[PDB]
Design a binder for these strands. Sequence first.
RNA 1: CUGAUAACUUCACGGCGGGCUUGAUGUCCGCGUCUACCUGGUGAACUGCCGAGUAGGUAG
Lengths: 197, 301
Amino acid sequence: KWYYKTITFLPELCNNESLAAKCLRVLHGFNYQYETRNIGVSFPLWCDATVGKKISFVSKNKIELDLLLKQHYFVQMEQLQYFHISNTVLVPEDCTYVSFRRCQSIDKLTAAGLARKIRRLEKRALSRGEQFDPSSFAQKEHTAIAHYHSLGESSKQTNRNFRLNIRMLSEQPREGNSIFSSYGLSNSENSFQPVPL
Amino acid sequence: KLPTNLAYERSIDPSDVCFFVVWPDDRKTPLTYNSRTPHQVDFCHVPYGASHIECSFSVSFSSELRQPYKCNSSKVKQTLVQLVELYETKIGWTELATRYLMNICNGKWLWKNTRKAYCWNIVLTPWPWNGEKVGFEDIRTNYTSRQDFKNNKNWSAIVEMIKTAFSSTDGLAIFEVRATLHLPTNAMVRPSQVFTEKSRVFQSTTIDGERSPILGAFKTGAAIATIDDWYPEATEPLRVGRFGVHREDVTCYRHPSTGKDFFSILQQAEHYIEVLSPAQETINDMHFLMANLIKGGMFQH
RNA sequence: CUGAUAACUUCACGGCGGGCUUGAUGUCCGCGUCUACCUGGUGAACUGCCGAGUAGGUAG
């Protein structure tokens, strides 16, 4: 009894990161005007290398998904036909079943991010005693990172080119009765909520 | 001409470079990097809390340009022996020795690690030597032209002892070189890269047990040899090769259609004995001829 | 429009006995491979917060 809004990502010369973010940035302007928690992630054509075309939009209250769909982006990208509206159909209750969660561990692995980390560990140990050195803090030689399909995003308030990191987990048939958040999640403070794709 | 077997041996001997991280407590550790994964990508940075970064190599100025290594013919023997022996008198080793030394002095061998730096200082250690360590302090704001070097207390002796190292048979001159780079916090360091015939795999070595990058020994031999601006309408100094090859753009100057490559000047060796027995271009191409015999190479067809 | 026209070769079967390739053997002396080599990440994935934490989490 969920819905789905299958999009079509056609014109054969297009980025997969900049358009999956801008169709999510127009979702990011949402939930700051009509503050809901109910719209998911659901990539149908996720693959390993060079993620494909389709994205979807899944909810149980299932009438904000058309309210989200008419928010000065499809009413602004209509004639030069980049995308088109789906048929607003009930999700059949037997399908494939994945989960989308922000990992956020990868963001604190880069060399600037580890210097961002050990700067914070410098000051919050203000309860004295030892006089520690920053010499015994290192990443060693070896971090094996396969694939995570990062999505870049500019900050709302200031000028920061931050980035997201979400991968695939497909099990656990019962968590999360539509308890999503601003970006759509399965990690923070609520559950590890799966997605019916 | 060019009788099928001729070869010289090089006359400048640089070594690898080593990167050490000095702490505020006067402790030095090797600079170690990180690897991320066939497809493998490397990442190197200054560790947080460090004062600056040190570098040390060594170079030698020997005399293997007086006679060839194999010669095959006693008409190209006494001709090329006489050219290097007449260039010693009429021209002198001054214009070459000053150009090789400044690329050692002004940190040219630090390729792209000087961009975004506050201050760097370079200390020589010559041999044989009676005296003091030679210094070049805050090079960006104190030493920028041929004349700032000539105001130094110790420039008359280090332009010397290379001039003797080319003039006297079985000569020698050895320089130890040390540099300190004051780079900002969490600054990126750029070493050499392994070839890997088809990314960014570092050339490493083992210093005190842990791995560390080198920035190459053929890489730092290219930086000292960039003294070539006698190709016609020259705007930028190039590395000394036979056909004046530029690397960034994939063109080359000095092409044999121009008549200014090495093999069309080496054949003209008997022509230049007459004038040296003239300051317009007969000088400005022997600086290219002498810088090829200092380079080395097989000269044969 | 053929040295033309037509055309059933068949039934049965025990190769067997015996057997010493041997004796002997010194592959040695001499030897220079070498000279010369750029792989090219501009700025780029930035700054917090909880937790004792090189574990873990969490923000725009």
